[PDB]
Amino acid sequence: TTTMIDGIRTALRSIGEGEISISAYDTSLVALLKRLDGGDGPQFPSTIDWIVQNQLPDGSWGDASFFMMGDRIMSTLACVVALKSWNIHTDKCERGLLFIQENMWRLAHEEEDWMLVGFEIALPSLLDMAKDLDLDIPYDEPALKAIYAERERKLAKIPRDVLHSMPTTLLHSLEGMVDLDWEKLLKLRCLDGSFHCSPASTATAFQQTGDQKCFEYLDGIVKKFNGGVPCIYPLDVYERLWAVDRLTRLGISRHFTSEIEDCLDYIFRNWTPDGLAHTKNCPVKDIDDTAMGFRLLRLYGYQVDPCVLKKFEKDGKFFCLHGESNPSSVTPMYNTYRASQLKFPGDDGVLGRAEVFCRSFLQDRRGSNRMKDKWAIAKDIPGEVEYAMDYPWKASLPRIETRLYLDQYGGSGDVWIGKVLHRMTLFCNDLYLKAAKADFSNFQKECRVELNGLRRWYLRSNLEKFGGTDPQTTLMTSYFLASANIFEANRAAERLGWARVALLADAVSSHFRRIGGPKNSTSNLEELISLVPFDDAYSGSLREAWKQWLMAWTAKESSQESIEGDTAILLVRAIEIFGGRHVLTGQRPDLWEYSQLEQLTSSICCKLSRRVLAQENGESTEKVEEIDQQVDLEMQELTRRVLQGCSAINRLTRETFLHVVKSFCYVAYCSPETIDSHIDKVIFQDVI
Amino acid sequence: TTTMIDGIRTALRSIGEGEISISAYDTSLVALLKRLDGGDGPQFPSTIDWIVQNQLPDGSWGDASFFMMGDRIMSTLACVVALKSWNIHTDKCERGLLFIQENMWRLAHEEEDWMLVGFEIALPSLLDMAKDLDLDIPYDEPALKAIYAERERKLAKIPRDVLHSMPTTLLHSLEGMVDLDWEKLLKLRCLDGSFHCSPASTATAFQQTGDQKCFEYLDGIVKKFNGGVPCIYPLDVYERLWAVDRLTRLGISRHFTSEIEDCLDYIFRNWTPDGLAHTKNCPVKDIDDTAMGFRLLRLYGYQVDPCVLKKFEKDGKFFCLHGESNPSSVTPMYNTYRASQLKFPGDDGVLGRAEVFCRSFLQDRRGSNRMKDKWAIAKDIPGEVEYAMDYPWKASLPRIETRLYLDQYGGSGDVWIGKVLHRMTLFCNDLYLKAAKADFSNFQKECRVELNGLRRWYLRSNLEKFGGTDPQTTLMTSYFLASANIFEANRAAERLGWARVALLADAVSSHFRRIGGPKNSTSNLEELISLVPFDDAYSGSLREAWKQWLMAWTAKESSQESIEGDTAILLVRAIEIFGGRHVLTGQRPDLWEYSQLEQLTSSICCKLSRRVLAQENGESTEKVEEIDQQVDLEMQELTRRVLQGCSAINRLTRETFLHVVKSFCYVAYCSPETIDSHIDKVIFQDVI
Numbered sequence A, B: 001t002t003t004m005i006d007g008i009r010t011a012l013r014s015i016g017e018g019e020i021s022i023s024a025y026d027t028s029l030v031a032l033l034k035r036l037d038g039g040d041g042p043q044f045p046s047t048i049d050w051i052v053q054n055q056l057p058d059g060s061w062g063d064a065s066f067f068m069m070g071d072r073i074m075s076t077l078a079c080v081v082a083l084k085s086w087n088i089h090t091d092k093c094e095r096g097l098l099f100i101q102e103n104m105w106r107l108a109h110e111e112e113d114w115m116l117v118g119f120e121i122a123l124p125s126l127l128d129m130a131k132d133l134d135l136d137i138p139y140d141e142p143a144l145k146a147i148y149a150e151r152e153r154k155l156a157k158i159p160r161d162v163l164h165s166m167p168t169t170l171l172h173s174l175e176g177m178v179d180l181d182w183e184k185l186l187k188l189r190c191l192d193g194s195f196h197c198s199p200a201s202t203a204t205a206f207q208q209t210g211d212q213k214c215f216e217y218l219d220g221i222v223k224k225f226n227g228g229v230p231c232i233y234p235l236d237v238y239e240r241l242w243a244v245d246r247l248t249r250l251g252i253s254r255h256f257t258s259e260i261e262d263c264l265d266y267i268f269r270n271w272t273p274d275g276l277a278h279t280k281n282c283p284v285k286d287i288d289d290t291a292m293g294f295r296l297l298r299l300y301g302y303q304v305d306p307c308v309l310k311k312f313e314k315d316g317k318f319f320c321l322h323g324e325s326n327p328s329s330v331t332p333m334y335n336t337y338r339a340s341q342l343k344f345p346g347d348d349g350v351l352g353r354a355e356v357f358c359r360s361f362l363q364d365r366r367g368s369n370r371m372k373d374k375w376a377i378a379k380d381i382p383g384e385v386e387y388a389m390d391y392p393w394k395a396s397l398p399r400i401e402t403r404l405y406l407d408q409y410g411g412s413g414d415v416w417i418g419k420v421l422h423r424m425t426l427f428c429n430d431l432y433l434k435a436a437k438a439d440f441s442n443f444q445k446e447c448r449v450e451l452n453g454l455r456r457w458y459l460r461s462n463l464e465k466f467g468g469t470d471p472q473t474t475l476m477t478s479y480f481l482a483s484a485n486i487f488e489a490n491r492a493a494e495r496l497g498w499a500r501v502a503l504l505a506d507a508v509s510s511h512f513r514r515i516g517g518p519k520n521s522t523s524n525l526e527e528l529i530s531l532v533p534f535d536d537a538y539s540g541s542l543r544e545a546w547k548q549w550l551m552a553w554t555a556k557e558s559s560q561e562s563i564e565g566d567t568a569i570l571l572v573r574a575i576e577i578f579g580g581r582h583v584l585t586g587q588r589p590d591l592w593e594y595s596q597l598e599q600l601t602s603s604i605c606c607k608l609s610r611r612v613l614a615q616e617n618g619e620s621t622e623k624v625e626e627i628d629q630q631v632d633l634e635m636q637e638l639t640r641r642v643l644q645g646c647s648a649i650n651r652l653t654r655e656t657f658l659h660v661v662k663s664f665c666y667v668a669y670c671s672p673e674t675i676d677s678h679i680d681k682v683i684f685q686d687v688i
Helices: A002-013 A025-032 A046-053 A069-085 A090-103 A119-133 A142-157 A161-165 A199-206 A212-223 A236-249 A257-269 A287-298 A306-311 A330-339 A350-366 A381-390 A398-405 A431-460 A471-485 A489-515 A525-531 A538-555 A565-579 A588-616 A621-642 A652-667 A672-683 B002-013 B025-032 B046-053 B069-085 B090-103 B119-133 B142-157 B161-165 B199-206 B212-223 B236-249 B257-269 B287-298 B306-311 B330-339 B350-366 B381-390 B398-405 B431-460 B471-485 B489-515 B525-531 B538-555 B565-579 B588-616 B621-642 B652-667 B672-683
Strands: none
Touching: A002 A257, A002 A431, A025 A046, A025 A069, A025 A199, A046 A069, A069 A090, A069 A119, A119 A142, A199 A212, A236 A257, A236 A287, A236 A398, A257 A287, A287 A306, A287 A330, A306 A350, A330 A350, A330 A381, A350 A381, A381 A398, A398 A431, A398 A471, A398 A672, A431 A471, A431 A489, A431 A672, A471 A489, A471 A652, A471 A672, A489 A525, A489 A538, A489 A565, A525 A538, A538 A565, A538 B538, A565 A588, A565 A652, A588 A621, A588 A652, A621 A652, B002 B257, B002 B431, B025 B046, B025 B069, B025 B199, B046 B069, B069 B090, B069 B119, B119 B142, B199 B212, B236 B257, B236 B287, B236 B398, B257 B287, B287 B306, B287 B330, B306 B350, B330 B350, B330 B381, B350 B381, B381 B398, B398 B431, B398 B471, B398 B672, B431 B471, B431 B489, B431 B672, B471 B489, B471 B652, B471 B672, B489 B525, B489 B538, B489 B565, B525 B538, B538 B565, B565 B588, B565 B652, B588 B621, B588 B652, B621 B652
16 A cells, blocks of 8 residues: 555655664673773763663574574673673673573584674684683683684785775774774774774774764764664665665666655765765775666666776776675676676777676576675575576566566565674665565556456457467467556556557468468558547557558568568557657757667667577577677667667657567567466466 | 727727717807806807807808708807807808808708708797897798798697606707696606707706706716717717627627627616617617617627517507607618517517518518618618628628628718717727728638639549539639638638538539449548548547448438438538537536537438429429428527527537538528629629
């Protein structure tokens, strides 16, 4: 119903600097800082109160929806050391210490990459702080020795001055780091004095330098939460992109266009010639957010250039980090290859290079269980990434994608890896499922009835007097092609018109093939168009377009012409007439653009038709590859012409062309045994 | 040009109580009244000044555009007696007296009915007042004895108490009357104390009774003229009707609709259940103004009832005066018979009785020179009244009437008879000629070019492959029928559409007759409609109506049906489509009215078609009279349905039906030898 939509809208108008689950680990360090003015106790007890409030039934601390030793142990350690250092509420320390001691051994049995960032860097400092309290603690553990060895390895791996000159990710986790400067390192924080926007690093920093820039930041965050802090703040750009991405993939973006373009122009104003980070001011930038923003901004008529990607290339390779070549995960390259589809022909080839590198890197590991990310856990990655690597941009239909994603969006059941298991709900909410699924279900139920309506219409016209193989399957497929490009209820007019004239042209093409052609013509077929229920105004235009199509049928005879582009042009003209829209006065650029679009469509149709023709003759595949490249070029070109926010022509008028061409390419790029499958899944196979 | 139109409009918004030429005769009597407060001189010298200003080159007084002894003599008499009674400016009396004396004899040679009202009644009192001055005056004249004898005759003809009880016209001219009461006669003046709204009677009355009601009236009129008074005042209703009558007959009423309906509702508010007079308050009412107002009010959607005419009927006769049966003139009965056309069937038969009585009274005297009125002189009455008695309401076309009237409207060259030769210019102006003629001329020049346009179109279509006798004359007549019902430039769309589909239907009817009928059908004629240049929206509706007409052609075969009403219904539908108008939601009354109109049209067409059919077979004329009555009844009925100001349907939508039916009746009620005549006169024969 609507209430979900309205709540989501109002919550979406209220985009703050961030919405993430409040962490406890960092709060514990916040408690460790005393009162500034030589006070008697800690700086802020609100954190303390928050801590006492949320003692687990097993005394632990952390998200209950999951169970992770490496994180529970650190949360418990930080809490117990904080409260007992300040020597208060010792009973809770006792309550948790039993679980601590009895769980001390489970750590040796963890997963491969489920290893928190600097996890082996804080834990040493953790037990160090502990040995001042020095309770009963089995410090004796080979796991401790292993992480110690890795500590020494990475310590021998890191420089001193490059570390003191070049701002790197290590500044995110510097508290477990020692043996440092405070002036050469002083300037390597963010615009707000935060080091990598992480509160723990800055808190430990202020512990050794009273720069008010850190105090004001922390005070603001603790004064905006009143007990509790996250592990990273803020995440404006991150959530901004990641919400609109869902709302596009969830097929509900039809309603929130205003707020959508609001966050869009925000990102645009904050766009850099160098890349993007989770926040506006973080100097170090990564590739994944950059690519995602690139894709989304292009997809809405914003002029950007992709040579910014020339920073994440590594001399014939690509690595998500700028300066670090570590084995990347699936998601960054996934979004990269995705954004690598909408290439405009006037752009540098870095996009193509990244595309081929990415597809190579992905297709191999696809067959195995390599879909495990190092920094997030979702419901089902493999299916999504597989379909993506399967159905290119030119063969993508919106409804089938949203249907597939309806079982691949996890909602709340996800977690995000950081220094602690955190989760965001602003865009990982679950009411999104209710809204989208209700919408899709009613949409299905509407398509179901209009289907039978069209069925009885088609039977009334006795069109099978010159039918095909069987009218049922083909009429189903035809109406499906229309329904898949337009799902809004208020356009069933254009929907049914499309389907009807499609069936018509099919019938007459069949009849013409069966008799040989227009030399064997006998009947007045320019009246056959009347079989469509006509309005008062929509009559004459259609008959004119129909006679035009017939004249084309005449002229295309005796030659080696194809007969497809004619049909596509007829289709777009008719869809427009049914949409009841005109063009304006027609300054020369306007009709120039129009004719350009039409010529592109006709050419593409002829080309891929001939390709299919050769495909059926067992032709040598190299020819198929040649023709595929050929259609690809003008495909890209047409897309660029449709996606220009500077166009003088209307928008819907543009996307119509896309609808038709995508329909044709799709139906020309799959066996029916998949088409019917998709058909039943989207129509008859019901949700909820 | 426009300036004439704007001046006429602004002058028309300024309708005063009256606009008539200022008389001098009555002013002379006004001068005769002394100062009220025992003053030293006359009451108002402004009249005197006015008099001295306008001494004629022959010393006389009166309109110079005409020369009438009976009036010049009285004006001169009144002036000389006034000025010399007050013994001032005697030289002017001498200057005029020579012409007076030398003209004293011409009076014996006047016209039959060119005899002013009470002319023989004031002249005796005139010479009576003179014999006090008693200058050289040949009182000896047999003409004086004749008018004296008639004085005595009428004095023996008039009663005393009926004259003292019943307000009659004699109260208009009572100054030459003596031997009277002043109380029984006191109440027989108008609402304003004026006796018959004439200033002379009231002035002589105040001379013998100082009723302020007369003083204020006269003061107002002399204070609103500052020297000079008319012979009758005011004339609000008179001019109100007589201006809009012209503006309707002059074919320019298209522009002044606001002010038109303003004066209309004025007359309506002042409408009585008893009749009308020249002014609002005159108790005695006459028939001519009543009938004229009746006609004009009905012609604009105002509900009135005609039993008010039962007052002017004289036991099987009609006489313009209520109570006096004197030999009437042409004009009153003329307007009466005119108003007697738009009879609604639900009305009493007094209209029909008056119609037959009037036509009988008129047709006889038509052949002679009986078109002389007793109270006005115009340019050419006979032609106008003849055409009126020739072309009934059902056979009246607006353009031919306005063209004929363009040579029958005299403009300023007219005079109006009263106690003195007076003239009004508010509605007898001459700039009306400039405006109307310029309009008509440009209209002609537009029709001339669109004619050649349609000619070349008709030739382009090769329609003569199944032509008629000769395309030229018939296509001319067809386009003429359209142009004669619509002359506004902005409707050439509907004009040309009408003409084109008329030619079409003619062609196909011819082809069908020539082959025998739809059994011998061979070609797809429901495509023949495409030969008309179609717009984007106006296409489908026309093809639908065309196929409807064809289906009618099919069904009407093998029967004794006619094939005309179908054509008329097709015509109105097509004219409407070209006009680009719809009906509203269609509450039941709406479509009820619609269907009613359509059924009426079809029936009338069939009936008069069959009548013409019998007419060509030398059928017995009584059958023709029977069928004529038959069409007449439903003709009246249809007219009543069109002329209801209470209709829920639009106006133009209504008058369209009238246009078509009037076209059909007209073309069915005249030899072509008159049609072509009218055609050349209206199109090629140019004005100015």
